[PDB]
Design an enzyme around this catalytic site. Structure first.
Site, mmCIF file in Angstrom:
data_model
loop_
_atom_site.group_PDB
_atom_site.id
_atom_site.type_symbol
_atom_site.label_atom_id
_atom_site.label_comp_id
_atom_site.label_asym_id
_atom_site.label_seq_id
_atom_site.Cartn_x
_atom_site.Cartn_y
_atom_site.Cartn_z
ATOM 1 N N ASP A 23 5.075 3.710 -4.557
ATOM 2 C CA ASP A 23 5.513 2.835 -3.450
ATOM 3 C C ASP A 23 4.305 2.040 -2.942
ATOM 4 O O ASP A 23 3.865 2.269 -1.825
ATOM 5 C CB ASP A 23 6.195 3.669 -2.369
ATOM 6 C CG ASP A 23 6.836 2.823 -1.295
ATOM 7 O OD1 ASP A 23 6.892 1.592 -1.498
ATOM 8 O OD2 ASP A 23 7.252 3.419 -0.265
ATOM 9 N N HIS A 59 8.319 -0.797 -0.669
ATOM 10 C CA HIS A 59 9.638 -0.754 0.011
ATOM 11 C C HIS A 59 9.679 -1.729 1.174
ATOM 12 O O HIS A 59 10.810 -2.045 1.588
ATOM 13 C CB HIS A 59 10.032 0.646 0.509
ATOM 14 C CG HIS A 59 9.342 1.080 1.747
ATOM 15 N ND1 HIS A 59 8.215 1.902 1.722
ATOM 16 C CD2 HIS A 59 9.628 0.863 3.046
ATOM 17 C CE1 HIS A 59 7.812 2.126 2.954
ATOM 18 N NE2 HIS A 59 8.647 1.475 3.784
ATOM 19 N N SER A 78 5.540 1.577 8.877
ATOM 20 C CA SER A 78 5.967 1.635 7.465
ATOM 21 C C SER A 78 5.020 0.764 6.624
ATOM 22 O O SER A 78 4.790 -0.431 6.984
ATOM 23 C CB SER A 78 7.421 1.241 7.376
ATOM 24 O OG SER A 78 7.903 1.461 6.081
#
Length: 290
Positions: A130, A74, A236
């Protein structure tokens, strides 16, 4: 990688960091505060993914060899946000401690040769599989401040990834900065560290409306016993790591995934399960490396 998960400034000098013993003992103290400044070289696999133009922290990442960085899919590919990066749009910074200062003669800047995203990465419903790898243009040179983390084998994954055991999130609060309703406090100036307990799978599932895959685990304290340790202190696509009591090595057990759960602190951090996806990781490293 032969030398992986032994830090030049700790395991190699018979030094221990301030909280690693609490991890190895799975000890949860009565104390409320957890999410502090890291020691220099505490996380020498820590990587920043930066936009070429203009310079900005996109994401965290982790060094797994001289040519290979691991992050979340992502971070590279999210069509709903019009996010679609090429090798050419990106660089990485390795060996950093300061969030903002250029750390001459400590940090290295690398370009990417190639990006690989799990062919079954799914952004549509939930962020399933992911995971992504980035090949550096040139191998980076290991130093006191730049050293790769281990990826777990089957026995290390079974042994370490268990409810109530304690793992570690390091970063510069990029997850917080991304998802924060209000920017109240600013981003940290130095690398942050927080130790988080792994949560029972059923507790994770009841905690959210997101369909939780087996490609994911979750970690963090019950809101009930209020703790200042924050996952959002994480970046992230950054590392979630554990120390093996068997060989004294640091293993990356998780990748910081989707951070919508971050906003109200009654939820837990969600991590991509690295070992579950190791067949793809190893195939890419074996076939598309040297």
């Amino acid at each position: 990688e032969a030398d992986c998960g032994l830090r030049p400034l700790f395991e190699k000098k018979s030094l221990e960091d301030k909280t690693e013993r609490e991890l190895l003992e799975s000890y949860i103290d009565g104390r409320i505060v957890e999410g502090s400044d890291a020691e220099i070289g505490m996380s020498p696999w820590q990587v920043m993914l930066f936009r070429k133009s203009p310079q900005e922290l996109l994401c965290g990442a982790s060094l797994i060899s001289d040519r290979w960085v691991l992050t979340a899919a992502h971070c590279l590919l999210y069509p709903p946000w019009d996010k679609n990066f090429t090798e050419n749009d990106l660089l990485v910074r390795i060996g950093k401690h300061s969030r903002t200062r250029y750390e001459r003669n400590i940090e290295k800047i690398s370009m990417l040769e190639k990006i690989y995203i799990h062919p079954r990465y799914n952004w549509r419903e939930n962020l399933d599989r992911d995971i992504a790898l980035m090949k550096l243009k040139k191998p980076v040179a290991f130093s006191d401040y730049i050293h790769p983390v281990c990826l777990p084998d089957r026995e290390t994954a079974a042994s370490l990834l268990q409810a109530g055991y304690k793992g570690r999130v390091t970063g510069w609060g990029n997850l917080k900065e991304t998802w924060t309703a209000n920017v109240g406090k600013g981003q940290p100036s130095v690398l942050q560290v927080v130790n988080l307990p792994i949560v029972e799978r059923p507790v994770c599932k009841d905690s959210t409306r997101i369909r939780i895959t087996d490609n994911m685990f979750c970690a963090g304290y019950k809101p009930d016993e209020g703790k200042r340790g924050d996952a959002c202190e994480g970046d992230s696509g950054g590392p979630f790591v554990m120390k093996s009591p068997f060989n004294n090595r640091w293993y990356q057990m998780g990748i910081v995934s989707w951070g919508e759960g971050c906003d109200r602190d009654g939820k837990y951090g969600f991590y991509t399960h690295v070992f579950r996806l190791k067949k793809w990781i190893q195939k890419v490293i074996d076939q598309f490396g040297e």
